[PDB]
């Protein structure tokens, strides 16, 4: 599996207003582990994160030409790109190496920039938008966490509450999963502030 | 054929590109625009000739484009080759930001330009850009600077400089009544406000007639900002 | 092969006398015509229809882009209908591209730019044509007026073609910001009708609209009953 | 084989390589030097397929030596590190996939030291210590047993003479003496060659 | 799997004297278990002065000779003098390498006059890789009449044995006798012998029966 | 994923299921594929998900600029011959086993295009990996010229049998009933699962995960 | 093939034996295998040998251009690295080409390798080819900077002797050379086993 | 304004009728063939003290046999001796054997009326070369002096002269010359012609010299050796 | 593309589109270059005061290398053209030769591309020329001039720029091995040499520095006036 090459694991999640996004923290070659700051979810807006896993240099290239993308997208309108927008941006952009493809498998997770009505969405690494309403996931370990989602996740969960499930979902989720963990960082998008919160893993 | 081509890209019996410098002259007569460096931020102030009539005003501004995070540009003359000058310079910097990750300098900006202009005054045949640039833009290496660059692909930094209609007018103003390194940005907006006063003959000056928007520094982020009308109407009425 | 040097050259003046014509002939155009009221844009332009054997309905002026964007112009069809083409391939990109209607200001960039090619580009003319855009979305009115020199300018109304000036002046004192939909079309009617010279028909104006639900022709029927009332 | 090592304390990076280039039984050269002087501050450290690294750490060589006589002024190491990075994903799929293993130790008068580490499928990672070869499944660990983010120079060279002692003990591959460079606001200062 | 090399054998054979340079070779064109002709004469008369054979895959013979002489009407074109023996091996050698990637599957032996009047022949590879020696073997049957030239030719492994010059005759009986040592034995090899003799005078051509089963 | 056509006296009916699988694992629960062409002409979406979205979006923006352009409604001729000369031109490679309905001037006209490049009218046809049992049910009780109420109820008992009868399609059915006057989205039409209660409340006060580093930004 | 190359005191001395063998056949067995560039440049060959033949003739036809040029006798510098460059271009492509540059330059003799992935390497004591090892052997024990020309030659002679003793693709005469201040002089082009019969009694 | 590639009311191009006047305007060159070689002395026209003479170089190697000089826009014949000496070169690389004097001068003469303005698929060149040069050189066939102007016309001369003062100094090799001509009194008799044409009075520095002998390399007279010339004056 | 030929003989065998540029040339920013025993001086004249002007961004006397900097005349646009093109070509001969380039070699590399750009379709010639002046490995001093029509020459002393005849009648006069003795005699002789020529003994020319071995000096204004009163 070329997937999981480096591991790793990325899941948003709806709630009050407000959508969660999580990862996890380990950078590893196969079974190497190599760095536990390796970052996975890069902001494409204030309320608007893109949460990549996989191959890390699909990750790291994806990240970084849809912030190409997006800042000629910005400058270029008045405006700030609406989640489903971006959705379609990145759908796009993941689908023009349809033969090729990047091996990363974005979740992508913000508020309107209006209106502010919460969104998620995953995607495979082809580009087949699938926005849901409930969570997603990412990433070498995805059945654990549908599992923990599956089970915890309620409708309309305030923000804390969210916290607390994509705590416990995440932290759960990557024990059991060799190639991923060392850590967890989670995000926070409300209506007026963004909290990041890492988390305590098993640094083992 | 031969008898068709206007020759745009050949010197003259004295070595004066004749495109180059009647593009001056159409920018000669484009609308003045003149910003100033100072220490705590940089502002622009354009004429406009979206003067008075029944426009909507749908944009934030006029003559003032945004350029990357940190940066804008103020075009005067040919407007669209103005919004292609533009379009050209975001690409530019946002290509220097996939390629190095972090923003681009003004000074590798403009070069990376006024290497374009040049090119078309150079071969090609194509008519030069009539559009002169003032730029305006924060970088970790030099500071606030005002690149100006003109049709014929030269440029230079600048503390205050202004070009357009009455150029000359506002750089007489701008020697009589610049204070290096000590105008203040409000000091700034003072003396911009004075210069656009004088060589601005139609004739008692308003807010409809001018905008400014100004740069500076807030928390570590560089902060692009238009003046409101009402800011304008304060200025203007201090100015009095 | 074709020519490669630019035909538009700064005159020693420095103003591009190609434009300085092209806009003299968007100045002999038929007339053409556009308010912003608060909830749309009216679109209404002059037939200036020769012999009766026309099929009129045959061609229209005032094209949809698409759902939700018009265009009407002022001088050379068929440099028009190489726009309106250019309009609908742009404005398609954009739907594959982002998934979302062309905002209006995007749309005006973008054909701005392309009428700005050919003004600079090898033994090509500049166009012959001034657009008038109008669109909505994010529930609100655009109308831009796109050139030959390829700027465009964001209105609340505006008139061109034959006459544009005292049109404009017309506007100047007829024109105001909280004008609803119906009576906006009567005032640009008016407009026209000012120097219209041959009594105005639901056959030789055409009338266009753009609101929330979207552009779209009046056809002759409705555009007879606005010019009830005049 | 070929192992790189940095370290990245307060101040500095100590980053040291071995210096064998072999052929497939026999050391043809222990003199061999594993690290390219970027600019004042940069050292570019390259292992793996042969061509690939002369190649391609001198492509980025020129490109930032061409960068300071354009602007008068050198890459911030975290630019020369996304630039290789650049490079090298970029031409991952293409004609010429250079299988290149980096470490990019770099100072700069702002932010400070930074330690990027780059596996050969252009994965970019700053890390406060790393490791490449077979090698660094000897060494990381003992790294982590003795590593803090305080060390001081001196106690990161024993540190280092640790590991590398290490590696004359247990790691299978014959490996003599190795390149030791430190960088700091001072620039590069070519440090005694731990041999054994 | 299309195959696009077939060994369609045949060997050749050049002896360089002081004065001379022989070319040979046997004209059985054979393939799998057959035999196509009894008759196709593996040396190309290129020049005045040089002879140059071709062993192995028939059609790169063929297609390899004529771009030779192609490249000789060239050189004669731009130069007005025909190429020696010198440049007809370096420029074989360019030719035969230029398809390094799929290569000429022929093993040529140039043999010739150079301009000293004395002898020369380049042996080469499908890939180019020349050299002069002063006598050489070449295909099929390269293995089997290689050694015995060393033996009666370069003397080796002789002792108290005057190593006189190489006359033209006993050159010629140690042609003869030799393809008849390989058409014994060899498969690949007989049905005919074409000799070439280069001298000053020009080329005279002489051929020799075989063993035809 | 188990989509299935009809065509009745009136206009045709497309079904769809809704799930869509991550190669042994139900993703989606409500994932839509009757998606838009023309006005009046829809094109359900089976085999390789991104393929049918991209290359069905690609000839639904063909068809709307051409639509504009003669001025007219869409062809499904038109639709069915961009969507298979697209697919042709690719070799198979985009999987994309469209089925386009729609309703032009000549009739109800229920194409289905493979992914190579092989179209064939039918009057009724059921795409994906419940094909099987679509195929089964309306060849059991298809008939020329139906009612549209037996035509919906009709093409659910076929999506049905495909979402019981196969492991990866399930969910609910869609099917969109067109016609001559227009078009009708008829979103999830059948419910059979109703799983979506539970008895295990799953809460943990806020507290109970051990935090180690923290930080809030402001907006 | 075995080919190496040493330098001293005064100046480098490159020995290669001469033979060359297709597969499990001797060829030829008089080759020679040092390609002459300059007056006083030398490169050797191995691996297979028409790209030894092209690359490194080619690489004599850069050196040539160059010192018509600029007239100033290219250095093994630029040697080495520009048959590094043809080499590196056509990476992966099949190319068996491992060689030598040896030669003498404003910074002093100068003793590159130049290997068909594009590997280079200054240095003391080189050894190529199928019997390198061997050379290393015999090279290293009995090798000291301060060798005087004659037990340079006879250590070369050692060298490639039992290099081509313990090897089955390597035999027939040792040609070594002298790349002195002044330029080259080829030393010697002696057999090898009358030479294992002077060492074996 | 017409084209480049006109033909006049005469029958010759313009721009080869024009570059040949060009040729004109440039300083003095002269060579002569002997059967002992070719000598090749050319006027450098220095324009102020402050040049360093061996700047001026206007008899440039093509290889180790053949010498060329030039007169005219020496800009120009910059991309005829690279153009020179690639092609000797390769013919080295492919061939084996060094090039004919008529080879080389054929292949770079190849490139004069090689310009137009229509065809172009690169930026071809757009006039014709304002050079004229002079290859010098020894092969089999012995020593040769093969004259080339713009127009592409190489032609085999005894002793030729190009440049300002062609007109005279030719005057000159006619009067001087003799099949039979010693090498030396090949040297001496150019620096008596060039004596006679030059503006500023002779010296080893404004002048070069370059012979190509049947068994010696092309070789530049240094400034001592061009002194001991000129003591004959 | 455009493809005409612009640069075109005329009835007198001249180029006048290189005529033209060279008198591009001649009314440059006056320039002056010194070659010394162990130093090499530039000074380019004055150029723009301005007193709102930004020093640094407005020089003419940029760097190509470690060892070779280069003044000019004339389109400063086009010179910086030629500077960038300049700068790739000597890193790209550092990775083909891992030898800094000679002054020879970018000087004659300069050469060719003004040369091509004089004889190309639809593009004019270089209003540019270059005194690029440095130092070979071996340390001698180098001063090479390029003008718009490509030939170059080495120098001991030359002008370029507008009024270079009487600068280079100065230089002519004035370059004896008594004035480039030493260091300060040498930058005496240059800004000596433009106080004919620049706008009052300024700042109005400053100037530029480069030692043997060491990469290019370039002066302030405070210096370039120690030695303005030191000759005024
Ligand atoms: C004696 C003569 C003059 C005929 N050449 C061959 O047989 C060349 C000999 N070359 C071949 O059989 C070609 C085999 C081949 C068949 C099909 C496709 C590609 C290659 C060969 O070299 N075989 C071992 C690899 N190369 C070497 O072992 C080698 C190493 C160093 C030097 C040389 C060398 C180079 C030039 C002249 C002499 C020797 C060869």
Redesign the interface.
Known sequence: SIMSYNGGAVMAMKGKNCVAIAADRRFGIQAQMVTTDFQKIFPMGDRLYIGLAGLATDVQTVAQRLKFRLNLYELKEGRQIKPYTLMSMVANLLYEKRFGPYYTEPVIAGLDPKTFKPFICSLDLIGCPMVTDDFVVSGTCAEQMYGMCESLWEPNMDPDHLFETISQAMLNAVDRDAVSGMGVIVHIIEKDKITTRTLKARMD | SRRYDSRTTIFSPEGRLYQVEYAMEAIGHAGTCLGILANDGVLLAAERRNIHKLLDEVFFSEKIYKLNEDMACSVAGITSDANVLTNELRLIAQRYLLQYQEPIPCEQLVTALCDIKQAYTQFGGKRPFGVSLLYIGWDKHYGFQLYQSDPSGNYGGWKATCIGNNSAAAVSMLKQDYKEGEMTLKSALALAIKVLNKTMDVSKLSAEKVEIATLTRENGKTVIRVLKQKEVEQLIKKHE | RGYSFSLTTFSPSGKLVQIEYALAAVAGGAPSVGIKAANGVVLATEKKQKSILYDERSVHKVEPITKHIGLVYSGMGPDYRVLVHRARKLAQQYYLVYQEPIPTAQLVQRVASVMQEYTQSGGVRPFGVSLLICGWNEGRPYLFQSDPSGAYFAWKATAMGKNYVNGKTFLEKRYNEDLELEDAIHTAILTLKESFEGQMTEDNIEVGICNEAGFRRLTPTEVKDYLAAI | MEYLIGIQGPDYVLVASDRVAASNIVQMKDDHDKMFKMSEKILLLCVGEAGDTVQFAEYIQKNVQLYKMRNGYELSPTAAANFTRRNLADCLRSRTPYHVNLLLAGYDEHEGPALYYMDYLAALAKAPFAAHGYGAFLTLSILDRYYTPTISRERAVELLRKCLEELQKRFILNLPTFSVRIIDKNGIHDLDNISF | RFSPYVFNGGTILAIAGEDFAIVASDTRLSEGFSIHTRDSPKCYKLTDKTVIGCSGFHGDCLTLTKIIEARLKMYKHSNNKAMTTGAIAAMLSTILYSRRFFPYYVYNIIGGLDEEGKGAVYSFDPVGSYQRDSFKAGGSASAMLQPLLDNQVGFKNMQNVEHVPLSLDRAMRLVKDVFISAAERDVYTGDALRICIVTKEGIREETVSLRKD | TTIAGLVFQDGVILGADTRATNDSVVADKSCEKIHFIAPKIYCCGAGVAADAEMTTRMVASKMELHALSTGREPRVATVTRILRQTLFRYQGHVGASLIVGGVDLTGPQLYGVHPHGSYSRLPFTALGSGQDAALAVLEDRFQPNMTLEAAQGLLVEAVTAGILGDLGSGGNVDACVITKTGAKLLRTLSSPTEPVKRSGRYHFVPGTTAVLTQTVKPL | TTTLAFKFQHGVIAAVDSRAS?GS?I??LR??KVIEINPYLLGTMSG????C??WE??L??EC??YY????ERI?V??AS??L??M??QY?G??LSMGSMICGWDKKGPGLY?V?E?????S?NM?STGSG??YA?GVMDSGYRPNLSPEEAYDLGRRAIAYATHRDSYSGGVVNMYHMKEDGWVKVESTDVSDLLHQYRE | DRGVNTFSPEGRLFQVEYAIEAIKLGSTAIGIQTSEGVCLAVEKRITSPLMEPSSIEKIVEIDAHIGCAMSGLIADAKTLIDKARVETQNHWFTYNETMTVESVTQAVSNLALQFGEEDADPGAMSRPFGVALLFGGVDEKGPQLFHMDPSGTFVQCDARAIGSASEGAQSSLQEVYHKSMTLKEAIKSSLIILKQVMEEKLNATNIELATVQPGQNFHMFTKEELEEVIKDI | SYDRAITVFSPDGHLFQVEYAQEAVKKGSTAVGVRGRDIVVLGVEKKSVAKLQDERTVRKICALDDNVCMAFAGLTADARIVINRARVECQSHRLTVEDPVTVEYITRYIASLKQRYTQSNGRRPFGISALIVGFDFDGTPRLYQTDPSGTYHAWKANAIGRGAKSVREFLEKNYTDEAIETDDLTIKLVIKALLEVVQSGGKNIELAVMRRDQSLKILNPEEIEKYVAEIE
């Open positions: 297709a056949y060829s030829a080759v020679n297979c040998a028409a790209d033949q092209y003739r080619l004599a036809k040539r251009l018509l040029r600029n007239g250095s510098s630029a690295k520009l590094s460059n080499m590196c990476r492509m099949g390798y290997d992935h594009g590997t280079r390497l240095g080189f390198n090892t290393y």
